[PDB]
Amino acid sequence: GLAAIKQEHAAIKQELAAIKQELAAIKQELAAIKWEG
Amino acid sequence: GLAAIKQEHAAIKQELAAIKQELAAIKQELAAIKWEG
């Protein structure tokens, strides 16, 4: 069970990484938008 | 015990998946307001 919990935490870590990649993509769009106001 | 921890991890993972989907939708909406597509 200690290894099982560590694996579940690793899965959560991967989803946090995917969220960080979406945040970066949003910031990229905001930078483009900022030129156009 | 161990089973209840595993359930809480499943709920956390599911919520992170939903947050990720919402961020992807926000990114698409932002991209669409730019002058060039």
Add this chain to the structure above:
Amino acid sequence: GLAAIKQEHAAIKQELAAIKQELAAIKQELAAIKW
């Protein structure tokens, strides 16, 4: 140990709730930009 894990998981859940509140606020600003 089990109570500590439960408390840590409750704190994580509360932060997820706060994140959903910020998402709603982002959506409000974007809707204002497009209104």
Add this chain to the structure above:
Amino acid sequence: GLAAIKQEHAAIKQELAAIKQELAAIKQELAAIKWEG
């Protein structure tokens, strides 16, 4: 095992706090774009 689990929970909490702060920054940036046109 208990110390390792606590450390990973602290990492998850810290990642979520950082995600929340990035979202607050995105919200504030969008508000600036809203005001300036």
